[PDB]
Design a protein around this ligand. Structure first.
Ligand SMILES: Nc1nc2c(ncn2[C@@H]2O[C@H](COP(=O)(O)OP(=O)(O)OP(=O)(O)O)[C@@H](O)[C@H]2O)c(=O)[nH]1
Ligand SMILES: Nc1nc2c(ncn2[C@@H]2O[C@H](COP(=O)(O)OP(=O)(O)OP(=O)(O)O)[C@@H](O)[C@H]2O)c(=O)[nH]1
Ligand SMILES: Nc1nc2c(ncn2[C@@H]2O[C@H](COP(=O)(O)OP(=O)(O)OP(=O)(O)O)[C@@H](O)[C@H]2O)c(=O)[nH]1
Ligand SMILES: Nc1nc2c(ncn2[C@@H]2O[C@H](COP(=O)(O)OP(=O)(O)OP(=O)(O)O)[C@@H](O)[C@H]2O)c(=O)[nH]1
Ligand SMILES: Nc1ncnc2c1ncn2[C@H]1C[C@H](O)[C@@H](COP(=O)(O)OP(=O)(O)OP(=O)(O)O)O1
Ligand SMILES: Nc1ncnc2c1ncn2[C@H]1C[C@H](O)[C@@H](COP(=O)(O)OP(=O)(O)OP(=O)(O)O)O1
Ligand SMILES: Nc1ccn([C@H]2C[C@H](O)[C@@H](COP(=O)(O)OP(=O)(O)OP(=O)(O)O)O2)c(=O)n1
Ligand SMILES: [Fe+3]
Ligand SMILES: [Fe+3]
Ligand SMILES: [Fe+3]
Ligand SMILES: [Fe+3]
Ligand SMILES: [Mg+2]
Lengths: 457, 457, 456, 457
């Protein structure tokens, strides 16, 4: 009954029967058709993996971490119930992802439904609830030892945080809330998992080594609240981990061609929004933007919509079809130029829609015969940080010393090295053009340099 | 202009502008949605790679081999025209596959159109002709130095076969037809790419090294036939290559669960046929089985059909929908038994329908409460061999000595070692029980040994 | 003192304080200066690893396998003392190697003291005895629940063989085939060899011992508990044996490595009775005689090679000339090998008589330069699956998923017809000291005459 | 006769017969008994590699880079003679290393003979001249195509430096002087080789990718002389390369235990001096410290001296033998504490011998149990920078743009990112103790804390 599955990254993953029963559901098997990198597959031809193996690996890593922590410290009183709950929470932490992963919740939803705030963790929680109530998993849960009344709440809290504001587990079990997702300093098994998987698949070498971190992990009584500590001689390792994350974002996740491909795919989805019907619960009909209201219709919302629009013949989908055909001919939107890392100004989300008008309104000192409108400019804003919005993540980590392994201390930046970056946040503004002839590109470059000079960038 | 594509297997790759022109067409871009294995993805969760990178790697390897051969021996008169032709041929060799790769032409087409002999190489030739004719590539070929009226014929001969039978090149360049596909002994870059990619993705280890083979490769003048000859010390490497191929096939390609999943998918496709329509050229309508006769309809035929049937709501497609739902719940068909390599049994193409019937035709002297019917079975025969029609390909490999490297000699199996296999092929028979009832499972057990042990087949 | 060691092959290796105490001894640190492949470093530049990491990895793998076995079946009653003893036995299983490892006991001792039958496992047992007696480890052993009388005998029986075993009772018989398996050869030493050699040499491995460890049980056979394998993983074992044969043929039996080992052995033989090694009580021992004293054997490593190479004394001239000829790559020439035929096997006693046969042969055309049998070296290489033509996986017991507690042996025909047809072979190689270009044609004519004369 | 050798790092690398004859020399085979890391072998058990493979790989990499640069631009007039000279220069760039590599020329010679300044590049030049003269390579060089009079000077200049300053080649071939060893910036194939080798042997995973850098390399015309420029989009890769160098240094090359072991070995060597006799030319006897005055005595100075001292029997070498025995039982010098890395002040090499006196001269307020003399302390100074002593190496690198490839530009640190280090150099001080008992450790820590607080960090 103890199934074994072979993963290209890890070794052989040992699966509990309850996890096997949970996995064999349509809701979880939906993840087989949602790619890990939406627009990045058309730049790296090796990044064709999905979130299925990602969730499997995250669950495996959570189980390994909790097992090691329990083994090295027998007074924490960790039972099989807690291990099963942690593995279940780590297995179903990305059930709410939509088509093309982060594109759906970062580019399409704000542009189609700006009156709703929706992240993928909310969708994950609702999808997990739907799966549990639909597939009849509770009697198995009491069969195998779990108590659904508080275990469901614990698993829900492990994903979206509080909704000591927690209710699943008491105060002396706080170290169980910082495994799958950490809300304090952003160190978790999810980061390690996708670091390893993306580095293996893209063709880019990794730097971080999580096994050494697990070997030197401990639980301290920091501010009358138990939490995971780290050995004080691995501060440079954490800094290198964050540098590796920054390098991955710089090289692969924020590629210009991939970003513009995501933009064109989102444009096609927006143009093909009012002509796609999805059957919901009770025979109701939904839309692409409205499908995040009913899970019975959101279950069948995957990357198949791209080929549905591309292979269609309906006369009402002509524009989106043409956009996709231009995508497949590499008639991409041209790239004009990027502003230097912003001197000092922060652009909020609501200011994104006014930038093309500002770019087009700028009058060059030299008159241009060609004229351009605000509709033919794509302005993109990129944010780079350490996950804490100008804060130092290492300032929230606790370290211990070998002489007294029961005490936690804090380490400042000045005590590590002088070769560290001064700032922890950045912004980058990118401008693209729709017109492709050389004269329009030259005019767009003149407009861009004039606008950059005018706003003092 | 020159382009560079990163590959997790072969590293950075250089691309001629003509290759970039050929790549950016819908006929080539449809390979992004056809999987390399098919049903193995539901057994190995890391086998999600497609044929796009496969074609890229095969073309790259063919170019490298041609370059090395031309460099080492300058008297062979290898020009850039031949290198471009070989790279084009290797890039468009798997252009004619359909949904789920070998599942389509292996199971669905023979089981739905028994009166037509169809293989994916002829489909690849037709697709290449359509791609050339529908995109205007001949002027580009003439611009870059390729005479289409001979080079297209040369590429087609490299793809499908002879159709001195060859007419693309004179008999002097008789070694250029054994690079992309070899029909004499089976040594070609296609297998090298297969091994490297599949072992990287699945998690299996291979010991073959094609770089060493490239280093020691040479062109030997066998009687009136220039051929590629290995070196005398490479016999062990060749035997290791064939052993690795056999182990790969046994471990991955003929798994117990992958084959039955492929059979269930084929059954769902057969049930769903005549209710799925694909628009061809001129507004005509086609089906899945008839799509192969029109290239325009065949272009829009990929793995999208699986999700098209799965998410459908028409009452006409209830049976296929239920079969796919059973796939999604991991309620697969049960395994009856392993018929073993009994002996002289050499079931040929003619035996295709009556084999399943004679498993319940036995009349043992046992009283069974439940009676098992003969209309529900699946029986398949696996061809475990070296790919040389139950023969040793080592006798088809030339060699050369240091003293006389321009003279070809042959080394037999005896001179290598006595630990080589005595027989190079065998046949296995696998039978499947569509019914899943527990009582019928025991009934199928008794009716299995009676057909196998007593009838010694 | 729980320490952590980072290894290129495995991950971070944990060490019990007893293992750390045993490691920090001159006898164990002596292993840092003995080459794993010996003379193979002069053909493969990447083969520079030593026995220290090999011993550490073998101990780690033995501990891992014991822990897995104890975790899977809670009814075997495996305690911490047993796993500690297995780890110790796996750690100190190669303490007896000499200069260039296998070369010493394969070529030097038979040719230096033919009357002594000596293997390196006996040397390992003697070195373990010396280390334990000299470094005061017995109180430390007692401090962790180990009884020296029984447990030291158990470790010795694990290292070298003897129901003949006395360290443990007969119901713990599954603890005697982990570190070393004389029966069929399924142990952790071959796993470590495969992994480390494939990583360092530059060759790709095919075996995966983690899957094997995952599918290991203890199923009783003939009233004897044994480690059992799954019925559907026999192809993995066949691939393992094929990988072992390929690795041996590719690396361990290279012509240049063998001739370099032959030259080194000749230099050592010619340089004997001049080199003095100090022993207990101020005694002096030779290179061959130092195997009778462990304190003198401790100071015998690959340093002798450089001592002879850099020597200035006039008594060691010939060995220095041989080493210099090695340094200029003026190695002995290779004429040609035979092929497996005749069903006759050349044994040890025929080693010296073989060179005279080729010299005594009469070529068709007389040679101006005469050839003597005192300058011929002939080597015979045996290739097999670790057995004497016997099937290796015939004594291993399998099990079925339906009934795990019961063992069903599997034959060779049930697996497939794509399997080898033999489990033993032989090869014969001839080397000539005289590397002059004049004798290249003369040597070949003499060689081809001998094979036909002896019906090859 | 192009010999082929197998490297665990690279593939099968070919060697010219001239390189074959140069390698088969005692002066080159001496490198088989010199370690790459020296004292780091006792902390990382897998780091047992020597300089032989490193030299072979550096030669191979230099040859490959020259070949690629010549193929990209056929107008550089690169001939086979220049490629061969660069390969020879790369092969023999480390012939002057002493025992334990860097330990010798970093600790022993500055302490054994303080009145002479020596570097292993001068030793490499002397060894190359000795090899060429003793082995009679000049007629071989004349036969193959090299002119010894100019090529020997060219190789010597490539190895050590200018000694327009250069004379081996004219000013229009100036790009060949920065390949093996680059003085303008720290970018050369030496780093590209030992990065990969040390990563492969230490168990750490590399980050840099030299093949991509070689892809985007071009020859410019900067300051009226040809140079080598990267591409403007590859600046972050260079920053990551320097970060990787710093990380490797911090993690491995400056380990506390390795440094203390090197210090103990240096002390043992200093004590063993004046008792070891090495025979040079003419029967003269040379000490360890004065053996650098004759290459015949230096050829026999390898790691064998360590085991010669350890296995000695004479009563003269009792002290060094006792020190080595203390090392072998793992009774090392203890540890006290660090100092906070901070610039604005530096400790010159002249003050290295006075710091322990200052530490022992501190006056703790509370009387200690035992009084410690100046010989009971060890003080170590670590200089960690980017290789240019507070300068920015990227400020000396030239770049070129895709639109105009022949124009060289410069890029400022502000144009790259705001998450880069502000400084490029730092210093640390490490204090050790020569006693092991607890009271001495406590007293040493008190004295060190008082001294650290005395000078007001
Ligand atoms: N259950 C399950 N197994 C999977 C899945 N994906 C890959 N596998 C692997 O595929 C193998 C095949 O298992 P099954 O499909 O259940 O076939 P089976 O072993 O004959 O079925 P059982 O005898 O009931 O265990 C398993 O051992 C898994 O490791 C999945 O989504 N669900
Ligand atoms: N052309 C092309 N590039 C691909 C493809 N798949 C991945 N790539 C990579 O994606 C990168 C984007 O290339 P381009 O389509 O030319 O986009 P670009 O950055 O605007 O480059 P230019 O067209 O020259 O201006 C290329 O460098 C390729 O390495 C593909 O199918 N076609
Ligand atoms: N003891 C020991 N450690 C080794 C050896 N080889 C590598 N190491 C590693 O090197 C590290 C150095 O540790 P130690 O030699 O004990 O010195 P240390 O850092 O002061 O440790 P403590 O003295 O216990 O505080 C260890 O953690 C080991 O992981 C070896 O042969 N013996
Ligand atoms: N020459 C030489 N080869 C080495 C060295 N180290 C490893 N090798 C490898 O060992 C192999 C043996 O080469 P040789 O010693 O010349 O033996 P050989 O090939 O029989 O010599 P020839 O018959 O003259 O070709 C070579 O192919 C090299 O790849 C070395 O230091 N010098
Ligand atoms: N840092 C990187 N490391 C490895 N591969 C990379 C890296 N960045 C991009 N690649 C891969 C992605 C693609 O397969 C390929 C394209 O190279 P890239 O330099 O991104 O071209 P590009 O699209 O920016 O074109 P252009 O040269 O016109 O700017 O290289
Ligand atoms: N950053 C690193 N990454 C990988 N391996 C490392 C690293 N640092 C050290 N190692 C290796 C070197 C040794 O083989 C082993 C032990 O190192 P380390 O943890 O530093 O021990 P130590 O004895 O110096 O420290 P401590 O006693 O404070 O734990 O791990
Ligand atoms: N304390 C130590 C230990 C490690 N290294 C060693 C490890 C590397 O293998 C070697 C690098 O060799 P070189 O310093 O001779 O190479 P470069 O001359 O190019 O130095 P750099 O790259 O800093 O310019 O130094 C070191 O610098 N000193
Ligand atoms: Fe995630
Ligand atoms: Fe193919
Ligand atoms: Fe061993
Ligand atoms: Fe170097
Ligand atoms: Mg998070």
């Amino acid at each position: 009954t103890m199934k074994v599955i072979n993963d290209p990254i890890h070794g052989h993953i040992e699966l509990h029967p309850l996890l096997v029963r949970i996995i064999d559901t349509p809701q979880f098997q939906r993840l087989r058709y949602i790619k890990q990198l939406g627009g990045g597959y058309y730049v790296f031809p090796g990044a064709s993996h999905n979130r299925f193996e990602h969730s499997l690996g995250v669950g495996y890593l959570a189980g390994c971490l909790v097992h090691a922590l329990g083994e090295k410290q027998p007074e924490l009183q960790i039972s099989e119930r807690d291990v099963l709950c942690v593995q279940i929470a780590g297995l179903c932490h990305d059930l709410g992802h939509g088509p093309f992963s982060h594109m759906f919740d970062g580019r399409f939803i704000p542009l189609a439904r700006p009156e709703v705030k929706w992240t993928h963790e909310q969708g994950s929680v609702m999808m997990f609830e739907h799966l549990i109530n639909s597939n009849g998993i509770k009697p198995v849960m009491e069969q195998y030892g779990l108590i659904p009344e508080e275990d469901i709440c614990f698993i829900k809290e492990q994903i979206v945080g509080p909704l000591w504001p927690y209710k699943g587990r008491p105060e002396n079990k706080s170290f169980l809330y910082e495994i799958v997702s950490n809300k304090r300093n952003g160190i978790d098994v999810d980061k390690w998992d996708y670091f390893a998987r993306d580095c293996h698949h893209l063709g880019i070498q990794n730097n971080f080594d999580y096994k050494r971190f697990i070997k030197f992990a401990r639980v301290c009584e920091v501010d009358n609240e138990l939490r995971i500590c780290a050995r004080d001689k691995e501060v440079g390792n954490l800094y290198d981990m964050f540098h590796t994350r920054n390098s991955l974002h710089r090289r692969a996740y924020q590629h210009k061609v991939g970003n513009i491909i995501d933009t064109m795919i989102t444009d096609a989805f927006l143009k093909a929004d009012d002509y796609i019907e999805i059957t919901g619960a009770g025979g109701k009909k939904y839309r692409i933007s409205t499908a995040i209201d009913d899970m019975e219709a959101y279950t069948k919302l995957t990357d198949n919509i791209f080929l549905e629009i591309l292979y269609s013949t309906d006369p009402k989908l002509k524009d989106a079809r043409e956009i996709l055909k231009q995508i497949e001919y590499r008639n991409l939107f041209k790239y004009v130029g990027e502003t230097q890392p912003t001197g000092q100004i922060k652009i909020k989300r609501e200011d994104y829609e006014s930038l093309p008008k500002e770019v087009a309104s700028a009058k060059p000192k030299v008159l241009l015969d060609v004229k351009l409108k605000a509709e033919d400019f794509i302005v993109d804003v990129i944010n780079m940080d350490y996950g804490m919005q100008e804060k130092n993540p290492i300032d929230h980590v606790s370290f211990y010393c070998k002489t007294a392994p029961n005490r936690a201390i804090r380490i400042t930046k000045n005590q590590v090295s002088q070769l560290l970056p001064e700032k922890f946040a950045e912004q980058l503004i990118r401008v693209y053009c729709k017109k492709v002839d050389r004269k329009s590109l030259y005019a767009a470059r003149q407009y861009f340099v004039q606008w950059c000079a005018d706003r003092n960038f």
